[PDB]
Design a protein around this nucleic acid. Sequence first.
DNA 1: AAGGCATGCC
DNA 2: AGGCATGCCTT
DNA 3: AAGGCATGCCTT
DNA 4: AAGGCATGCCT
Lengths: 195, 198, 197, 197
Amino acid sequence: SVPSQKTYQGSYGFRLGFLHSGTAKSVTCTYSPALNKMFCQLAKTCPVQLWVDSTPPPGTRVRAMAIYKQSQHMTEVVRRCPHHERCSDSDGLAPPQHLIRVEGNLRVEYLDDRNTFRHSVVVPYEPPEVGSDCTTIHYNYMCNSSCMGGMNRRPILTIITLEDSSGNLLGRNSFEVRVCACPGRDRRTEEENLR
Amino acid sequence: SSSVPSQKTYQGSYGFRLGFLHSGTAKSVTCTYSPALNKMFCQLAKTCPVQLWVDSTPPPGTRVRAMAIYKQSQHMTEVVRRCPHHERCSDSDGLAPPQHLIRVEGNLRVEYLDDRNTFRHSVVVPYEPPEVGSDCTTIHYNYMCNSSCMGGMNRRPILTIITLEDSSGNLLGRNSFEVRVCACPGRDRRTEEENLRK
Amino acid sequence: SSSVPSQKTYQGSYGFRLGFLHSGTAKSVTCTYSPALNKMFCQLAKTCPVQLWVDSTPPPGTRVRAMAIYKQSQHMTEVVRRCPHHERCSDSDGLAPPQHLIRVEGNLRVEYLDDRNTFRHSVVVPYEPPEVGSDCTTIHYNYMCNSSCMGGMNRRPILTIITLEDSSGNLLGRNSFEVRVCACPGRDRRTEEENLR
Amino acid sequence: SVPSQKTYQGSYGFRLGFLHSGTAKSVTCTYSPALNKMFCQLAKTCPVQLWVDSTPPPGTRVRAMAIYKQSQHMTEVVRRCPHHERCSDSDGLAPPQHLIRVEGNLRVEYLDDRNTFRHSVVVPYEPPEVGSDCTTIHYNYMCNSSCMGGMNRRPILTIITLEDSSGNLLGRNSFEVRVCACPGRDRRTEEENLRKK
DNA sequence: AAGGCATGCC
DNA sequence: AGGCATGCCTT
DNA sequence: AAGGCATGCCTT
DNA sequence: AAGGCATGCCT
Ligand SMILES: [Zn+2]
Ligand SMILES: [Zn+2]
Ligand SMILES: [Zn+2]
Ligand SMILES: [Zn+2]
């Protein structure tokens, strides 16, 4: 099967927010509204903001999961490539083969789905700090979109799911991702190609 | 290391908690504690008084352990140790091994431990009742690298976890505080408290 | 792993030299040799003819071994092998182990060695004297990763070392050449020669 | 004792030239004529030019050595700090303890002096490439001047000696070095400090 | 690149 | 100690 | 197949 | 930082 990518704001009015960081050639992470697509560097901080209109009950969780965007690849599990899965870059919390990690959260939980084989990463939902209007999660993507024998130049979507403590769905959003060496340059290229 | 210790405050059955002197915020005061951040700012090798408060005295053989861990989860599995320079300095107090970040000063019964499973350093003294007239037990800690030390803490913040333990080493109580070991404790304290309010 | 095998040229008693076809320099020529660099430029999995020239014929049972090594000293002790991706590729020729960078095509008497003491890989075939009117023996090698493969040669130059050896594995002669396995052998040879002068 | 730092051109007219790289904040390497001082980043290329009026014999060598500049530190051997000594920054040729390396010269040699324990790096002298008038060596400095447990904010000199094959001196030149994060910034600051208001 | 600031030292 | 010495971040 | 582009990385 | 270049892939 294929996990749903249907936007669902749900009862908490759950939306995603991004930092608008421009298009300098090698900016670490930038987001393109035209494309609803994140462009980021391998292993670097990728902030994603969680915006809600009302606070979810305690025990709420936030899951991220990658799937290939193109229909002919959707059934293939998105994983790190054979080279990077073997690299010495463990943070001591994440599985070597998971593409998406969360950094900065000791309560992070990774899953290898026993039936789908799909990887995901889950953290508990915490409301914004005082004064803040949104909750920021810092993701890292641990292969380039180009990785031979991994994503192998295929676009992926990251699906962000808000879940109750047992995994029932409360909210869903998604964005496309390109992990590459030069996010600003590649953001500009894809955008210009869209004209 | 492959695991991390708890930082969960645990008063336990003796009502265990920590107390800190009120100190300056003068640029380079040798040790100053921020209640807003629950964070100690201090200079390398300078006295850090930490007060132990209990509601009733624990049994003889009770011990007090201090251990350092990285605050950031992405570094938390890594053992906090001295940098290559300071490890090789000739600054022993007579008992402390050269690789240990935290020393206790002024106590003959101090012991330094390397965990053989976790590899983690800690320093442990026997627990003493507060002196006659006093309400708490003051221990004098030192930190033997700056937070900035290259090849050591390397600008990564740490927490010090203080545990009350029985003689076999089971937990009686736990508290913790962040530490920055820096050149200008008063300056840095204020900078960080200012940042809170932004 | 282990120490570096000698790369010293040793023509020996049989006058052992190598020779290479005088190929193209068009962008993506499958295989081209630069006399100036003593360097082959070739594509992944494409035929790389290598000529054996001896002044005098080696005895029955002589064998021809090739083995790759990193050119550079910091890299010399590391075994040249295929990157994790290509090693797990379904590209067997039926005979070569999947980790081996260097294959021989067209030769059912090929053997592949995983050296138990050095961990180094090599591929060896029986020596055959030239046929009739031919002045050399040609072996067709294939290189199964690009020089650039991350997790493998990772942009680090290699040498291939061809040894002539007796039926017992004793050295008879030795030659070597540098290799770059890349997408566009012609372009990259031009570039590299250009940069030399 | 302390090695001599006194400049002399000697019989080959031996002198150093530097590149004039300007003072942008983060320029890799830049040189101050007014200070006879090179400002450079840790581990980056520092080009140093050898100029001679006549060609010394082959077997002629060019050695580089750091000493502390201040008279009270002079007798202390200049070395990397414990942290950088330990880092994984090896080129496979240089000893981990040596501040000064030569990059891009496979003939480099390092010395630990048996009497003084001072470090040095030496390369054969080679004549200018045809159509050029000087020989360039690429030095790397492998600690910052500010490195705690190494130079610890003490200025140093590099002494470049032209030597015959016995190590007899043919020519000497020296210059101050500051290894720092922002050479351009720091050269500016230091030259501004030469001024009277 | 080159603004911004962290952090040692005076 | 405000002012500087000097490192490292990201872009 | 030369020309153009995709895309990682180094330089300053 | 954008420029430049290494180096795979394509039309
Ligand atoms: Zn990868
Ligand atoms: Zn230290
Ligand atoms: Zn490969
Ligand atoms: Zn250093």
